[PDB]
Structure formats: C-alpha cells, structure tokens
C-alpha cells in the first residue's frame, strides 16, 4: 500500500513535514526552491534531529521486527489518505531561545550569540505555523536574527582591524557608526551608541559625536551612562565640528553589506539573501550568504512557506 511517510510527503509542501518523513531529497528541494538554501551542510544536524522524532515504535509480536507508528497532527480527521505529521517545533520555542541570544549579546559573548542567532534563523523554515499573523512573527523573527548577526559580525571585525593608520581609524569609526543603524533592542542599541560616541570623540569628529550622544540619551540608558554621555556631549558642543569627512551618512538610508560592511545607500543596487534579507553589494551575487551560510545571495525564490495558509486555490 502507500506508506504513511509517503502520504505526508504527498500531503504537505512544508519542508519540516518532509524531513519528518525522511524524504531528505524532497525536503532539500523544497528548501532550495522556497528559500535559497544551496548549502545544506549546516542543516545536517537539524535534519537528523527532526528525522529522529518522526515515528514511534511498538512491538506487535515477539521476536519479530517492531512496528512503527506515525503520529499525525490532524490525527482525528486524517484518514489513511490525509494524514500529516505532528508538529514538534513551534514558534514560541524559537522565540524563547532568542532571549538567550540577547543575554549573550549583553555579556559580550557575540561569537556565541551569532551561533544561537543563526541556529534560530535556520530553524524558522522548519516551523509549521497556524495563523497568518504567526507567519509574520516568523518573518520578523528571522529579520531580528540577521540584524544581530550582521551587526555583531561587523563588530567583531572592526575590533580586529588595525588602529594605526588615520585611514585605518576612519575605517573603524565608520564601521562603528554603521552598527548604530542596526535595528537591535534598546539595551544593545545603547551599548553600540556608547561605543560609537567614544570613537568619534577621539576622532575629533565632535559634530557627529553630538548626534550619537543625543540619540543615546533618548534611549534612557542607566544613570551613570547618561551622566557620562551628557559630559561628552557638552564637550562636543564647545567645538561642534567634524575634523574629517567620513563615508557615513546618518540621514541617508543604509543597507549594510554583510560581507564588506560598507554602506549601500537607498536605491543603489543590492543583492539580498532570499531567506535572511541580508544585503550584499552586487559583486557578491551568486555567493553563499555569510549570515545564513546556507543560502545563495542572487537566488530568486518562491519564499518561505511555513503554513499551508500560504497555498491558495
């Protein structure tokens, strides 16, 4: 007859369903078309893990091979024909993990934070989502992950680059400033602003520093920080002026190149990761996304398909 796993495959477009089924090739294809995922290698743990949960086992008779049971999320209604695998991974689970990521960011554990963030980001396509808004949250969740990943990754590099040349220094300040734009939560956003302010201050680009200081204050950082910020701000006011011109436009909209960590203003051509939304300069197109690590930058895709609602007829 037809195996239950096969039934699941026939029944659902969702990639997780196929993984549960054990149909890797099918699942990979779905991930490849719906999302960009060219490089499956980072996926392997997720697949096996997901795969393991798919079916239960019980023994009909002794000394014979054990039987397998396939749980269905719609067990009641599903007949033999319309079964679909039980869930097992949910949006809340992913959201919960996010806090741990936040914690690591605050501590300065950025490298570890990236891993957790990326782990969640990759996991999003696995989900089966019940309602339309819930789908939006998933998309939003992914966005948050890339934002941190690119931002944190940019930060790690900035620290690495050499301080010695003036040009080198200008580069650092620029990158620090770029971080400012990243959409993080206020606790983190404040932290980055704090950093940028100092770099700009030493740079003697006081005018720009003043703007950062004001933005920081609005956030409402702890009192000690706020006081320090006010102190710096007043100093900046004495000589509001930027000594050097930097390749940074606070006002102009940006898009940080995930690879280059260079600004891409407004309209200027950009290539984006189908999955993450990470942005890259046109040169990168066709390459593996640094943020996602699985995806192809240039790839056009159907789009994430977490819920059956997405399919319409």
> Least CB distance from residue 44 to another protein, whole Å?
5
Candidate segments 59-67, 104-112, 206-214, 256-264, binder of another protein by CB under 8 A: 59-67
Pick the closer one to another protein by CB: 53 or 285. Answer: 53
Residue 52 interacts with another protein (CB under 8 A): yes or no: yes
DSSP β-bridge partners for residue 68: 57
Rounded-to-10 torsion of CA 227, 230, 234, 240: 150
CA-nearest of 35, 13, 72 to 312 is 13
Which residues within the stretch 68-87 sit at the binding site for another protein (CB under 8 A)? 69, 71-72, 75-80, 83, 86
Interface mask (CB under 8 A) for another protein, residues 96-115, using x and -? --------------------
Phi and psi angles of residue 72, each rounded to the nearest 5 degrees, phi first: -120, 145
Which residues within the stretch 274-303 sit at the binding site for another protein (CB under 8 A)? 288
> Least CB distance from residue 1 to another protein, whole Å?
4
Candidate segments 54-62, 127-135, 230-238, 299-307, binder of another protein by CB under 8 A: 54-62
Q: Say how far apart CA 59 and CA 45 lie, in whole Å.
A: 28
Phi and psi angles of residue 79, each rounded to the nearest 5 degrees, phi first: -90, -155
Structure-block tokens of residue 37: 């995922």
The conformational region for residue 65 under phi > 0 = left, psi -120 to 50 = alpha, else beta, is beta
What does the binding site for another protein look like in residue numbers (CB under 8 A)? 1-4, 22, 24-25, 28, 32, 37-41, 44, 47-49, 51-67, 69, 71-72, 75-80, 83, 86, 88-89, 93, 288
């Amino acid at each position: 007859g037809t195996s239950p796993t096969q039934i699941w495959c026939n029944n659902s477009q969702l990639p997780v369903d196929h993984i549960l089924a054990g149909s890797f090739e099918t699942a990979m294809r779905l991930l490849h078309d719906q999302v960009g995922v060219i490089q499956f290698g980072p996926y392997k743990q997720l697949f096996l893990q997901t795969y393991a949960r798919g079916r239960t086992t019980y023994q009909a008779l002794p000394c014979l091979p054990s039987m397998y049971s396939y749980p269905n999320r719609n067990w009641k209604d599903a007949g033999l024909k319309n079964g679909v695998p039980a869930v097992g991974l949910k949006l809340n689970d992913l959201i919960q993990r996010l806090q741990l990521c936040y914690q690591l960011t605050t501590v300065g554990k950025f490298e570890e934070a990236v891993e957790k963030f990326r782990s969640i980001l990759l996991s999003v396509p696995l989900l089966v989502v019940d309602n339309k808004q819930e789908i939006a949250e998933a998309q939003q969740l992914i966005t948050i992950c890339r934002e941190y990943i690119v931002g944190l990754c940019m930060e790690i590099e900035r620290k690495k680059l050499p301080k010695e040349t003036l040009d080198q220094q200008k580069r650092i300040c620029e990158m620090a400033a770029y971080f400012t734009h990243s959409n993080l939560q206020p606790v983190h956003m404040i932290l980055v602003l704090r950093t940028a302010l100092n770099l700009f201050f030493k740079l003697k680009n006081f005018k720009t520093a003043a703007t950062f200081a004001r933005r920081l204050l609005e956030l409402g950082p702890k009192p000690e920080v706020a006081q320090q910020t006010r102190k710096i701000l007043s100093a900046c006011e004495k000589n509001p002026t930027d000594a050097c011109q930097l390749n940074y436009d606070m006002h102009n909209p940006f898009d940080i190149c995930a690879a280059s960590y260079r600004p891409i203003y407004r309209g200027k051509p950009v290539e984006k990761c189908p999955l993450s939304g990470a942005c890259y300069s046109p040169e990168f197109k066709g390459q593996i996304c640094r943020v996602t690590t699985v995806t192809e930058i240039g790839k056009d895709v159907i789009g994430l398909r977490i819920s059956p609602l997405q399919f319409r007829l």
